[PDB]
Design a protein around this ligand. Structure first.
Ligand code: CAC
Ligand code: CAC
Lengths: 405, 404
């Protein structure tokens, strides 16, 4: 603390991201293995799967010779409009909402959490996250300045299902005018979503308590294989009059992980305030990164907008969702043939890319040590499996259960 | 007292608009003959957006590589980082003794760097010094990163239209030891005024004696003079003088990659264990903001930096862009001489890079704007948006503004 060298010498290091680390360990791991850490889709051969429609869009886009001039702060409008239309339906009135392009879902979550501090007192108003949830959610929200982060009950670790009664109690027990970060479909990590009727009950509670709803929509398409089906909760909440804030990602459903394409949108009840909310969002973006990367949004716009590419895309995503169910069925069937102790129906009843297996930290540690790389919380990327490794996963679960529990 | 969400959203405070934004909009919508010289992007000799030929080549090469779209590491695409830092510092002892990450271009590196520095300095008490004048977004970025005592150092001499080097030195010395100084590495924005080599060396010495932290904004290497070496002088000199340089790098102007957002943040730091701690803070800050950076811009810049043939093509293509800006500076100058406009006008050809402080009063800049010559009220013009034709128009309108 006199020369700059001395000043830097005192910088406090930070722990590394456990997920991204484990994925690195898995990727380095030796013989036959299952790298099931990160939620990234793999094909039948277990290899990365750039979508055929994205390969088509690459060539279309290159032939068009668009320029590289700065986007507006808010980003590439053709993409934003199509993207909001994909989640809210061709019905949606673009004029009654505010929406910007973001750095995928993470970017929309960070941006939205910061925005909310201009409307709510982030020193006092709680923000509620699901129990359990993406551990990065807590980090993002905290970094954005939220000082009272809480949990709503969601998953029942005994029944390996939804704890809906606990969720309702926690919504009602929260102070009025709190923020709730909800998973729009394919809850991460549990893979269990409310029913349609349960979503409508949640909406009525959010209304009666004057809560702010923040949807995280990272997996639209993966809960059912159908984009329209999976948009049910967002569309319901819109129809019910909720001022929905929603963070959207194209990393998983279009496979654009590396290009960072997403949106942040707000259904603003008072149209005269749209300009003011846009001006805050734009100042937040301007002071971080000035404007977003164009390539991913340009690619996604072509795929959303063109009727042929859009239908090809939806068929490709439907097939992706179906390979995941086949993998679930393969693991489940093998768990039955080995007569592994316990119930395993949640492997096939859960939806999305993951299975939340319900194993102990020690059983998970066992798995990792036999080259089955699932998280310590028991989360497994089913979309990482091949027929070979789905069988290995079951065999290792069977071993872990019979030998540690 | 707001109760419903709609009532809370009702109370949100709109954030005042960028006056440059409003002017640029006026300029872009204007009919009739005009010169839109507001926003800082390169235009070619026909006044048009200029995708680089080497970037169009690299696009096709990348497509033919059949690459996937899987996440980059949090810190970004490491071959890009390595080539990017080798470009600014050269193939030298530095490359092993630094920490660097990919960022969302210069802006991203500036925000990340300003946040990072709050983990080494007390942003509540330690002053951070910006140039007088500077890019208005500098103030926004630092304020938003948490800096509470934002100050300025004398830089442009509004009388001489050159550098106020004595005043700069005085402010460097008068600041408390251990302050942060955000320096423009080359092509100062908005003025085009840069210190000489010998002046940069005096500055390095002052920074060492005062134990100031140096934060370089490096948005224009190569693009300023046409030479990557020339334009890297300050960074390399400061490195050689032993300064722990924090540096924000952009490929927006020098590769025309405005839309793809490719940049780096790097720190020169000797101890290897501490390099890894610094890294861990950079990665933590990234992760909570956007998880990892976009790949397409980084893959384009890496291929151009690394492919020996594209690298050579690019340096020639950049040299020609820089030359064309000088050419426009020369055209304006000659016309102002030709028209015998009152006053000194040599600053038009002594300034370097895209931007020029023309030296006009507010009333004269208003006159330019009302005659469809869109420069800012502080007299900033983007020389690089001129054509031979609008260069002459500018000089003639300046000559009218000055005369009435
Ligand atoms: C983790 As994401 C939705 O920012 O690719
Ligand atoms: C203005 As920039 C250096 O972030 O493209």
């Amino acid at each position: 603390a006199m020369t700059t060298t001395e000043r830097w010498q005192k910088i406090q290091g930070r722990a590394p991201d456990p997920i991204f680390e484990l994925a690195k360990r898995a990727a380095a791991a030796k013989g036959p293995k299952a790298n099931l850490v990160i939620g990234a889709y793999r094909d039948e051969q277990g290899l990365p799967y750039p979508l055929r429609v994205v390969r088509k869009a690459e060539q279309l886009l290159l032939d068009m010779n668009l320029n590289y001039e700065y986007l507006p702060i808010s980003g590439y409008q053709p993409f934003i409009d199509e993207a909001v239309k994909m989640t809210y339906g061709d019905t949606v009135e673009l004029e009654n909402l505010v929406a910007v392009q973001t750095l995928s879902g993470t970017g929309a979550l960070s941006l939205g959490a910061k925005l909310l501090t201009h409307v709510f007192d982030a020193e006092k108003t709680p923000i509620y996250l699901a129990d359990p949830t993406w551990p990065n959610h807590y980090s993002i929200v905290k970094a954005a300045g939220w000082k009272d982060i809480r949990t709503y009950a969601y998953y029942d670790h005994k029944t390996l299902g939804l704890d809906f009664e606990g969720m309702k109690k926690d919504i009602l027990a929260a102070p009025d005018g709190s923020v709730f970060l909800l998973h729009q479909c394919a809850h991460n990590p549990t893979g269990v979503d409310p029913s349609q009727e349960q979503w409508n009950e949640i909406a009525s509670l959010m209304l009666a308590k004057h809560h702010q709803v923040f949807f995280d929509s990272a997996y639209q398409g993966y809960a059912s294989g159908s984009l329209d089906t999976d948009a049910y909760a967002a569309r319901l909440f819109a129809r019910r009059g909720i001022e929905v804030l929603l963070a959207q990602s194209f990393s998983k459903n279009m496979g654009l992980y590396s290009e960072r394409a997403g949106t942040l949108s707000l259904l603003l009840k008072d149209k005269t305030k749209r300009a003011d909310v846009k001006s805050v969002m734009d100042s937040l973006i301007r002071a971080e990164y000035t404007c977003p990367p164009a390539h991913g949004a340009r690619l996604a716009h072509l795929i959303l907008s063109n009727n042929e590419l859009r239908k090809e895309w939806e068929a490709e995503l439907s097939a992706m969702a179906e390979r995941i169910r086949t993998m679930r069925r393969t693991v489940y069937d093998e768990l039955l043939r080995l007569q592994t102790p316990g119930r395993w129906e949640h492997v096939i009843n859960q939806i999305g890319m993951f299975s939340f297996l319900g194993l102990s930290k020690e059983q998970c540690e066992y798995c990792q040590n036999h080259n089955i790389f699932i998280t310590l919380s028991g989360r497994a990327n089913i979309a990482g499996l091949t027929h070979e490794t789905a069988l290995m996963l079951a065999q290792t679960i069977n071993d872990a259960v019979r030998n540690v529990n």
